[PDB]
Design an enzyme around this catalytic site. Structure first.
Site, PDB file in Angstrom:
ATOM      1  N   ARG A   1       7.259  77.800  18.824  1.00  0.00           N
ATOM      2  CA  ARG A   1       7.563  76.383  18.948  1.00  0.00           C
ATOM      3  C   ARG A   1       6.361  75.563  19.360  1.00  0.00           C
ATOM      4  O   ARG A   1       6.515  74.506  19.981  1.00  0.00           O
ATOM      5  CB  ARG A   1       8.718  76.189  19.920  1.00  0.00           C
TER       6      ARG A   1
HETATM    7  N1  LIG Z   1      11.801  69.855  10.196  1.00  0.00           N
HETATM    8  C1  LIG Z   1      11.251  71.050  10.494  1.00  0.00           C
HETATM    9  N2  LIG Z   1      10.195  71.535   9.816  1.00  0.00           N
HETATM   10  C2  LIG Z   1       9.648  72.724  10.107  1.00  0.00           C
HETATM   11  N3  LIG Z   1      10.108  73.513  11.082  1.00  0.00           N
HETATM   12  C3  LIG Z   1      11.162  73.154  11.843  1.00  0.00           C
HETATM   13  C4  LIG Z   1      11.802  71.867  11.583  1.00  0.00           C
HETATM   14  N4  LIG Z   1      12.804  71.752  12.459  1.00  0.00           N
HETATM   15  C5  LIG Z   1      12.800  72.868  13.222  1.00  0.00           C
HETATM   16  N5  LIG Z   1      11.815  73.705  12.868  1.00  0.00           N
HETATM   17  C6  LIG Z   1      11.576  75.021  13.522  1.00  0.00           C
HETATM   18  O1  LIG Z   1      12.237  75.017  14.789  1.00  0.00           O
HETATM   19  C7  LIG Z   1      11.295  75.261  15.826  1.00  0.00           C
HETATM   20  C8  LIG Z   1      11.610  74.480  17.075  1.00  0.00           C
HETATM   21  O2  LIG Z   1      12.934  74.800  17.425  1.00  0.00           O
HETATM   22  P1  LIG Z   1      13.723  73.818  18.396  1.00  0.00           P
HETATM   23  O3  LIG Z   1      14.151  72.633  17.579  1.00  0.00           O
HETATM   24  O4  LIG Z   1      12.914  73.621  19.650  1.00  0.00           O
HETATM   25  O5  LIG Z   1      14.974  74.764  18.711  1.00  0.00           O
HETATM   26  P2  LIG Z   1      16.199  74.220  19.570  1.00  0.00           P
HETATM   27  O6  LIG Z   1      16.451  72.901  18.905  1.00  0.00           O
HETATM   28  O7  LIG Z   1      17.247  75.277  19.355  1.00  0.00           O
HETATM   29  O8  LIG Z   1      15.671  74.109  20.972  1.00  0.00           O
HETATM   30  C9  LIG Z   1       9.962  74.882  15.254  1.00  0.00           C
HETATM   31  O9  LIG Z   1       8.933  75.499  16.013  1.00  0.00           O
HETATM   32  C10 LIG Z   1      10.120  75.334  13.827  1.00  0.00           C
HETATM   33  O10 LIG Z   1       9.933  76.740  13.670  1.00  0.00           O
END
Ligand SMILES: Nc1ncnc2c1ncn2[C@@H]1O[C@H](COP(=O)(O)OP(=O)(O)O)[C@@H](O)[C@H]1O
Ligand SMILES: Nc1ncnc2c1ncn2[C@@H]1O[C@H](COP(=O)(O)OP(=O)(O)OP(=O)(O)O)[C@@H](O)[C@H]1O
Ligand SMILES: Nc1ncnc2c1ncn2[C@@H]1O[C@H](COP(=O)(O)OP(=O)(O)OP(=O)(O)O)[C@@H](O)[C@H]1O
Ligand SMILES: [Mg+2]
Ligand SMILES: [Mg+2]
Lengths: 527, 170, 487, 50, 364, 140
Positions: free
Chosen positions: A353
């Site tokens: 992330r």
């Molecule tokens: N629009 C996007 N484009 C590329 N990768 C994405 C996108 N949305 C989410 N990701 C992926 O999700 C990861 C981040 O997850 P996150 O949103 O923090 O998880 P959560 O929402 O469950 O906390 C990024 O590091 C990537 O791997």
């Protein structure tokens, strides 16, 4: 004068109950106590419960066998502390600060994490040495990335290889940008710690490393406070502007110890028998990872916690609790470990992330290509190759990249970007899959153009090991390194395809074929 | 007497940097300069270009990283890593003086191939090297050419004609 | 005049018991302990009573170096929180103390933290669509102004990125105010959001800000992590009722508000439920959710997130959060592993304002037709996995290709995802978002390839990408011709 | 026939896991409740009534 | 000197409480009652203190006809068991008493069963393959001299037969003193092993015996089964340290050691964690496992068996036993049902010496 | 009733907080008897009682189409029939998204009118065969 507070009422293994003295003296919470097991020796402890009748539920941490009922109990009035400083580097140490033999300053064990203003976002990398973790799962400094996997899948070896990788750079660069390391072995066997110390001494990675061991024979309270002690050693290196790396071995064992302590102290159970506040435990531990603000020295500490997994389930309580905390995860699958490839990372389930911001300029472009190539290759790779000459470029490059991902030890940055560049740009498309690593070995340790006389490049050769700091600054996609890189790789491919590939395919004898097979596996290992 | 500097969080930042630069110039081993940069940062004085250049000066002119010797020391790697810390991390950019120090080390070490990369990177960024150092680089190149040290000896030898895990050295 | 004092009985974790000779204060009352002994002002909040003279209360700060029978002051009021324009552009804790090193907080007034929900008469249901800029959301889940939204999904699905993109696309154009409430969030995400809102000048310190940020993170104890949402609500309901403005209420996330009280449930003596959650979970969540609603005075356009542990939708916490929402956006691991982002499942998610009377008829019809197509798409992966594509009718292959294009098309690159994608984001307007999906629904664009739809915005970008890919394909073809000519 | 046999095994395992999970949640709840009951003192706690 | 005395307080199964007027002895201290009252000798080790003037202790023999005020005598020491060459070719109990009806063991010194584990400085891991002659065991999961071995398998899969084949192969041609600790397994197997060894002149009573037998079986109460492995380790550690000699240690099996401690924990009142197991299971198992290590003085090449109830690897006992081992061997039931024996599932198995640095490259 | 599953959660909260003994899924034993206290009050009364009637349409939410749950198994055990909706049909345009195979009314025709019995018998004999035919035919 030492102040007494009561006497040991009872003792149940690693825990104890203190009954108050005739005086009304009060004790604080989470503070350390002492138990006069003898006129000379003392048994340290820690408060975990207070009660309406003045009794004190206490965790024991040293000399438990010497404790009895009726022994006097003194109170220090202070939280648990341990020695900290650069003098602790190169040592195996009890989480109480006691050194473990082989053959002034004090830091609080439970401190608050840096607040939202006292930590910069991630900008710098931590070269684990493995191509996957540096390309597609970029780990950064101030990051807290989990290592999952079933038993015997490479969880410990990844962190060890990271620590071993950092040493060559730390011997070159200044002592401020070098990343030190801590290996916390919770609940592990003592032999494994001895073998790790021997490995680090062989590769000389112990000058920049310390170990905090709380073995299975050791008390549960010591296994419970070990990672906090490791983070406490990392406190000074944060606040002294340095870098440091945490490697918490199995935190599930750290939670078993907390469960033992709680349930023996007559705390109520919860889901999967845990007290309930086991999430706040790992939260307090892992939120201390940060990349500190320039106001606080631009320091950092990465965390690489390790969690065991049962039958590749990510549904257990602790695994979910930790995935919720950690930024990324490095999922190690037995089906791939057992399926031949090592390290057994599963890219579909492993992520980061932080992404491009962690890895470097030279690695950003390569990772942007590799992510697309792997996303295209995941959709096709389930097909048994039938269009053997009609195969797409992606099916070739992805298989070659998976071959390059096979390692045993770490890899230098210069020794990885070039190898992945040749794949994404298709220079390693004529050679077959099995020879994908022998090619890399010659590309990194046996310069063919310098051997066969085809030396037109002014500078670009893979023998110096110092070109890394120019790739790391300018990038290969630059006016000066790109053409020389091409006019190195193309001649390497040509000389390979002419001299070595041709000789390889001509083998029919079982003996020479097995000799070659062992060579290819050895190249998979050393590179 | 200059533009007020600010952190990423918009906070005010100190610029009084000369007292720390003097601690760098007084150093004798070029690991102390790093600790000076750290102690500078803790006081909300981030390094400026002059400070990084003084650190590179102290690197180049010093004999050893620390009082005791260290294995794997590389006088050029620390300089180039400070350059990476300047450009990428901190946002400051180097100047002709910085690359000039970086080239002086490659001239002293005799590494004539990295010197050409430093030269090309200078003029690609507009910086003009000193011809004294370019001539020294080409001189070391000619010496290594005529003496056969254009490359190491272990590259200019035949590889095993027979594949064997022990022959190739792995 | 004088404030009564209470004396601690026992301290077990975040739970503490207190004696009160005269009479116990009410529930949810704040109780202070001076910083002289523990080093910091240790606040506490009564959760339940035990006896006429004894009560027990949770602590919102960590309890360290705390003796027994320490004096505990009755403030006579629950946790008061500042409200006003001065709260804008400032980080705040649960107690309302500003943790950012910007300065003191001007406060002409300070509202409490717990309050009754709006009455049915106060409530106002206005069907009005919110243009998020996101394509899936613009079509299948038209977010309603003044309503409630939920981004369900496990870990690593993109609900945080959806929150960031929705902030970037809405709060800029939102002439009202906005509020973010980090609950059990990663602290690093707080730094990233604060620096983004500063660089975007949503938080212009020298100028005028329009965004509050409250943070009680994973490092904090459960008593703080439970009372963050109430703090942010005290901030938001002021702007709703008093200022009369429209408010955005972002939350990340409610499951932490749940599991914090679950971490204290055993200490309070309450018997757990089937999954290990507290028995009062549904009531505890309703007392918060019902506060999040529009009134005649104003309207809170809330956007929430929920962690679905182990992707178990059957978990009681999301199961109870379904009822308290209007747009139940759902995210899934499968769509994310397929390279699609946002990883929304159109079938599993639904909206209240997806009605013919609330929105355009063509919009409703296109959405329902796509949802009807994707179910057949599932039923046909069921078959193609076994038989093969050869054993289906051409009318069936047509809808297969159309759904395969729709699924890839509803992917969208975001500006926030520049780090991961390496591609600039696109803002897709709702009107174009219907003309393009309808044109694809009726075969108007079948000659266009499939991957041209992957990770783009409108239809114009699709045709651009198709022209591109055809160019590079002709390049590979002629390069193969020239390679055969060479050798 | 093979698919049937696989389905009966899957059904047995599904129902087995279902019942075991029910028993596990029950024993958890009874354990937490039992621990709370164990945390109750037996002392008289005598006080003046005059 | 005069002996301390105490009085029984309450009895719950094997668990007893003892009030000591003056003071309570340390944990693990033995407490004996005369056979005049119960009918047989009975020693009881303290395991925890409830308050001052009280001690909770587990019985080894049955508690039958034990009363609520029986005087109890403090021996002043832990359960001492014999060591040396006199222990060779003799069956022993948890208490170190012999049951082979041969004669008095001519011991010179006795050692306690409870002992601190070796320090990190004493340990010396030397990687050397152990040729068992078994084909699966060699290739996939090669054993290590001085290391630990695990035969993880359910009911009727063939781990006891693997132990017997390993005895017939390794132990007889070992050149070092062997030990066999039966912990909660069939009494028939002990008789079969004793006769197989007395016939192979490994327990030649008129000569030199290269074996020791300890048997706390399923018939015995948990207080024995929970402290029998420690007795065998007391035998093995004397040969390891004092004699400086390589030894084997065949445990069949550790799961009943765990079961016994779980039953005991229920009697003690400790709150169960998972699947009705004791909260201290990991600690209780590591205090036994970490004693099994190859120091510089000698080496203990243990061969432990493990039971998996309902064929569940996720059971906490095997799950914790995995980390304390060098070479796992996960037996299966489906493979046995297919006629294959040994019923190994090599995909689940693993080893530590399976590296080219130890074993040859072709073997890897 | 919209809906009784939440009534059960409320009863569970009331019970557990008052330390009533727990049971399956942390529900007390008499939670079945709760719904029997309620649904049995629904009845078609006698001509001696004014011939009145109380019908009930209790709603119960499922999760992942689970029917082996406790509240669902209880209400199905109580009710004089059931209606089973499905999301796979709700998304496929079939709204109401019933599942006729699982939907049951033990009051089969005595409720229906003179005009409705003939039509319903015809539609039953039609749908029972339409199911067998559509289940075995291809997609094409
Ligand atoms: N629009 C996007 N484009 C590329 N990768 C994405 C996108 N949305 C989410 N990701 C992926 O999700 C990861 C981040 O997850 P996150 O949103 O923090 O998880 P959560 O929402 O469950 O906390 C990024 O590091 C990537 O791997
Ligand atoms: N990259 C690799 N290449 C070759 N072998 C590897 C690699 N990584 C791990 N291994 C091998 O896998 C085995 C176990 O690795 P490791 O010690 O990291 O497992 P672990 O996850 O710590 O196991 P446990 O969970 O039981 O502690 C060792 O034999 C090691 O040599
Ligand atoms: N190599 C073999 N060849 C033939 N039969 C075998 C082999 N190994 C095991 N068996 C059979 O497996 C059965 C049980 O073997 P064993 O006594 O070792 O079981 P176990 O693993 O000890 O399990 P338990 O102790 O629960 O019975 C016997 O019927 C035995 O013949
Ligand atoms: Mg490991
Ligand atoms: Mg057996």
């Amino acid at each position: 004068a030492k102040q007494k507070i009561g006497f040991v009422h009872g003792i149940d293994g690693t825990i104890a109950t203190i009954a108050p003295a005739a005086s009304k003296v009060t004790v604080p919470y989470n503070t350390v106590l002492e138990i006069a097991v003898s006129a000379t020796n003392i048994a340290n402890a820690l408060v975990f419960n207070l009660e309406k009748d003045g009794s004190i539920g206490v965790i024991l941490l040293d000399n438990i066998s010497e404790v009895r009922s009726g022994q006097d109990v003194y109170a220090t009035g202070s939280l648990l502390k341990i020695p900290v400083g650069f003098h602790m580097l190169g040592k195996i140490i009890n989480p109480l600060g006691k050194e473990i033999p082989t053959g002034t300053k004090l830091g609080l064990v439970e401190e608050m994490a840096p607040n939202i203003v006292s930590r910069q976002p991630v900008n710098y990398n931590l070269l684990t040495g493995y191509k996957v973790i540096d390309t597609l799962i970029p780990v950064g400094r101030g990051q807290r990335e989990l290592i999952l996997g079933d038993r015997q899948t490479g969880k410990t070896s990844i962190a060890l290889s990271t620590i071993l990788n950092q040493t060559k750079v730390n011997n070159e660069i200044l002592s401020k940008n070098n990343v030190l390391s801590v290996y916390v072995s919770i609940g592990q066997r003592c032999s494994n710690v001895a073998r790790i110390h021997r490995l680090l001494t062989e590769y000389d990675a112990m000058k920049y490393c310390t170990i905090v061991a709380a073995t299975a024979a050791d008390p549960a309270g010591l296994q419970y406070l070990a990672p906090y002690a490791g983070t406490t050693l990392g406190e000074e290196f944060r606040n002294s502007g340095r870098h440091i790396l945490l490697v918490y071995d199995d935190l599930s064992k750290q939670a078993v110890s907390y469960r033992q302590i709680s349930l023996l102290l007559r705390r109520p159970p919860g889901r999967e028998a845990y007290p309930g506040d086991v999430f706040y435990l790992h939260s307090r531990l892992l939120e201390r990872s940060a990349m500190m603000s320039p106001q606080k020295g631009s320091g950092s500490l990465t965390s690489l916690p390790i969690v065991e997994t049962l039958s590749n389930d990510v549904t257990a309580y602790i695994v979910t609790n930790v995935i919720s905390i950690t930024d990324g995860q490095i999922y190690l699958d037995a089906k791939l470990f057992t399926g031949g490839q090592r390290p057994a990372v599963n890219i579909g389930l492993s992520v980061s992330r932080v992404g491009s911001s962690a890895q470097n300029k030279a690695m950003k472009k390569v990772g942007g290509a590799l992510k697309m190539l792997m996303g295209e290759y995941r959709k096709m790779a389930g097909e048994q190759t039938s269009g053997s000459q009609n195969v797409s470029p992606v099916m070739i490059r992805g298989a070659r990249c998976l071959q390059l991902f096979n390692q045993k030890g770490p890899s230098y940055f210069m020794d990885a970007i070039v190898a992945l560049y040749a794949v994404t740009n298709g220079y390693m498309d004529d050679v077959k899959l099995q020879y994908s690593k022998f090619y890399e070995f010659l590309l990194l340790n046996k310069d063919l153009p310098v051997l066969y006389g085809q030396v037109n490049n002014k500078y670009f050769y893979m023998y110096n090991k110092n070109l890394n700091y120019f790739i790391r600054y300018f990038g290969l996609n630059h006016e000066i390194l790109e053409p020389e890189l091409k006019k190195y790789i193309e001649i390497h491919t040509n000389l390979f395809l002419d001299n070595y590939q041709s000789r390889m395919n001509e083998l029919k004898s079982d003996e020479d074929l097995v000799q070659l097979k062992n060579l290819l596996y050895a190249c998979k290992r050393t590179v | 007497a200059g533009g007020k500097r600010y952190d990423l969080f918009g906070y005010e930042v100190s610029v009084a940097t000369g007292p720390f630069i003097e601690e760098i110039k007084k150093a004798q081993f070029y690991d102390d300069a790093g600790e000076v940069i750290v102690k500078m940062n803790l006081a909300n004085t981030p390094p400026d270009l002059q400070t990084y250049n003084a650190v590179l000066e102290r690197i180049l002119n010093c004999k050893s990283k620390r009082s005791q010797p260290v294995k794997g020391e590389n006088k050029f790697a620390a300089m180039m890593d400070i350059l990476e810390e300047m450009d990428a991390r901190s946002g400051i950019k180097p100047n002709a003086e910085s690359w000039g120090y970086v080239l002086k080390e490659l001239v002293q070490a005799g590494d004539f191939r990295l010197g050409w990369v430093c030269i090309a990177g200078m003029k690609s960024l507009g910086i003009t090297p000193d011809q004294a150092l370019v001539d020294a680089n080409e001189a070391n190149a000619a010496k290594a050419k005529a003496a056969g040290t254009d490359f190491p000896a272990y590259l200019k030898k035949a590889a095993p004609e027979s594949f064997d895990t022990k022959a190739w050295g792995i | 005049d004088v404030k009564q004092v209470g004396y601690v009985q026992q301290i077990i974790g975040a739970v503490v018991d207190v004696t009160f000779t005269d009479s116990v204060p009410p529930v949810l009352t704040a109780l202070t302990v001076d910083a002289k002994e523990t080093g910091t002002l240790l606040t506490m909040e009564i959760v339940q009573h035990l006896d006429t003279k004894t009560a027990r209360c949770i602590c919102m700060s960590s309890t360290d170096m705390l003796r027994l029978r320490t004096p505990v002051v009755n403030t006579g009021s629950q946790i008061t929180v500042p409200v006003g324009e001065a709260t804008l552009g400032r980080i705040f804790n649960v107690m309302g103390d500003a943790i950012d090193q910007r300065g003191p907080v001007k406060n002409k007034v300070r509202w409490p933290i717990h309050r009754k929900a709006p009455t049915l008469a106060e409530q106002s249901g206005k069907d009005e669509v919110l243009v998020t800029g996101i394509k899936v959301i613009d079509l299948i889940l038209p977010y309603c102004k003044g309503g409630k939204i939920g981004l369900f999904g496990g870990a690593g699905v993109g609900k945080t990125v959806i929150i960031m993109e929705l902030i970037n696309n809405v709060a800029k154009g939102h002439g009202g105010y906005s509020v973010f409430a980090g609950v059990g969030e990663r602290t690093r995400e707080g730094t990233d959001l604060y620096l983004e809102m500063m660089g975007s000048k949503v938080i212009d310190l020298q100028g005028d800000s329009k965004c509050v940020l409250v943070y009680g993170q994973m490092n904090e104890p459960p008593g703080a992590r439970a009372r963050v949402a109430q703090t942010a609500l005290t901030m938001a309901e002021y702007f709703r009722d008093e200022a009369g403005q429209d408010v955005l209420l972002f939350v990340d996330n409610v499951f932490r508000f749940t599991q914090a009280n679950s971490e204290v449930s055993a200490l309070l003596g309450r018997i757990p439920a089937a999954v290990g959650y507290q028995p009062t979970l549904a009531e505890d969540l309703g007392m918060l959710q019902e506060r999040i609603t529009s009134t005649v005075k104003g309207s809170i356009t809330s956007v929430q997130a929920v962690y679905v542990p182990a992707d178990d939708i059957t978990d009681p916490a999301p199961a109870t959060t379904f009822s308290h929402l209007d747009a139940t956006t759902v995210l899934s691991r499968s769509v994310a592993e397929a390279g699609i982002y946002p990883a929304v499942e159109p079938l599993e998610c639904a909206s209240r304002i997806m009605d013919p009377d609330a929105i355009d008829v063509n919009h409703y019809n296109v959405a329902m037709d796509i949802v009807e197509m994707l179910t057949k798409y599932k039923e046909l992966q069921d078959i193609i996995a076994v038989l093969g594509i050869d054993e289906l009718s051409e009318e069936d292959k047509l809808i297969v290709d159309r759904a395969r294009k729709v699924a890839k098309f509803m992917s969208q690159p975001f500006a926030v995802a520049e780090v991961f994608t390496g591609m600039k984001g696109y803002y897709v307007q709702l009107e174009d978002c219907v003309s393009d999906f309808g044109s694809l629904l009726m075969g108007q664009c079948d000659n266009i390839p499939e991957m041209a739809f992957y990770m783009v915005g409108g239809l114009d970008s699709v045709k651009e990408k198709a022209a591109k890919m055809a160019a590079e394909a002709a390049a590979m073809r002629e390069r193969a011709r020239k390679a055969a000519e060479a050798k | 026939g093979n698919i049937t046999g696989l389905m009966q095994l899957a059904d047995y395992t599904y129902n087995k896991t279902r019942k075991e999970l029910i028993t596990a949640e029950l024993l958890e709840i009874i354990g937490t409740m039992t621990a709370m009951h164990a945390g109750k003192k037996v002392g008289l706690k005598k006080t003046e009534f005059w």
